[PDB]
Amino acid sequence: ATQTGRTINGHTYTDAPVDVKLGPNTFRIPANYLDSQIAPWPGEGVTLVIEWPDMKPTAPGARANPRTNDFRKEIPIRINYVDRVPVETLLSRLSSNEAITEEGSVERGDPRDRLDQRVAKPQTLGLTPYAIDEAKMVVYAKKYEARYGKPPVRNPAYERDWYIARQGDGRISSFIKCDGEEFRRDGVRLEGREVISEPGEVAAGCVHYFVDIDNKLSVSLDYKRAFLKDWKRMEEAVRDVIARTRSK
Template structure:
């Protein structure tokens, strides 16, 4: 049995989509699409190419739980994914759903503002075990393997540095990295492959009891530029060649759910608001 449901494929697809949009930087239009917050009018609808998009509730199943999310809250503005995964999209800065029928015609400016949440029911492990597994190598390497001691992939081998946005960044320990590289070369006969520019930044938030509550991995800025800058309610491309992005992990322990958020790195400052909005959405639309 897998750690997550088949919705894992959805997570990969969303990450690829975000990466693709990162490379396709275009200036926002004056219209900016600035998709408004979701209307509470359940009769609101829009027909495009013969399909009518609405705000009517569509039931999603996550393990034994049921949620009646408005159709336009789903990433495709239709409903849950085939195979059981659920993807929702909240539009920054209001962190509400876009009006129905705007997904097919969304501009790049609004793709930048779309915060996507991939939600899976954990059918093999407890939610409390997920973040420790994601920040270690025990579940992905064999005992005795030199790769188990890779400082890039273990939180306990990284070094905490000054807090940012209420998060603690954990940097790669270069002394440990040097020791790992020597051990790797001794075991495999060649140096460990490394591209420091491509190594993720790690950010951690902990619960009051010290347990991991949030784990965020982000691309590094290039030359201090993140690919986008905030101008009012818009995200505008800067001179960087690509958009740096973040993947943000947390869990719903009560319902044993794993949540992954995808958004541009320039929005990292709003990580708590995005996490809180996602939790509130799950609580609001849960029916069983």
């Protein structure tokens, strides 16, 4: 309860901790982490926000309208208690197509949405890029056309670049999908602490997944592809929050 921001519509914004339930655990999260900067929205899970480049929360109340922070620096963080699926296999199930294709359908053989049909690329930023295998699309498009009378649609929005990081035993520990350079340009540029946008350009986006197996949490970040180089500091900032705020 140390720091104080504006008072708007009667509410004085502070960084005082707020009790947040995720499964059976209670996390005492400084209010200014929260998307609302007051209390969790109704529903399961919570949304936090951190700010590029130092992965610190928005100053208390600075996101409240009229905002005083720079919205282009925000990185929204959806944290969920995982109780509908196994947390230990979540990242492998997101990177395949068992859920979005029917058992034994032509679409279950789609190489685009299965990690085990994509092609590993050379490491960069500690990530293994995984690319679409156009040779497998030829075979797929044949059985798809012969069975529907139509060649399959190559919609660039659903042909994202994928990135994988792994633990020593091979388990997936990070999974990131980004708009391809064919779908979207970066739409912003960075030098130092500040990000200024390119108008008429839609910023390329990534979604970035990881889990906390011990707390049974999934974490989903949505951020501009221009921020991708700092993916590890983002994980580090969120895992520190999770570690520090959990009520022992």
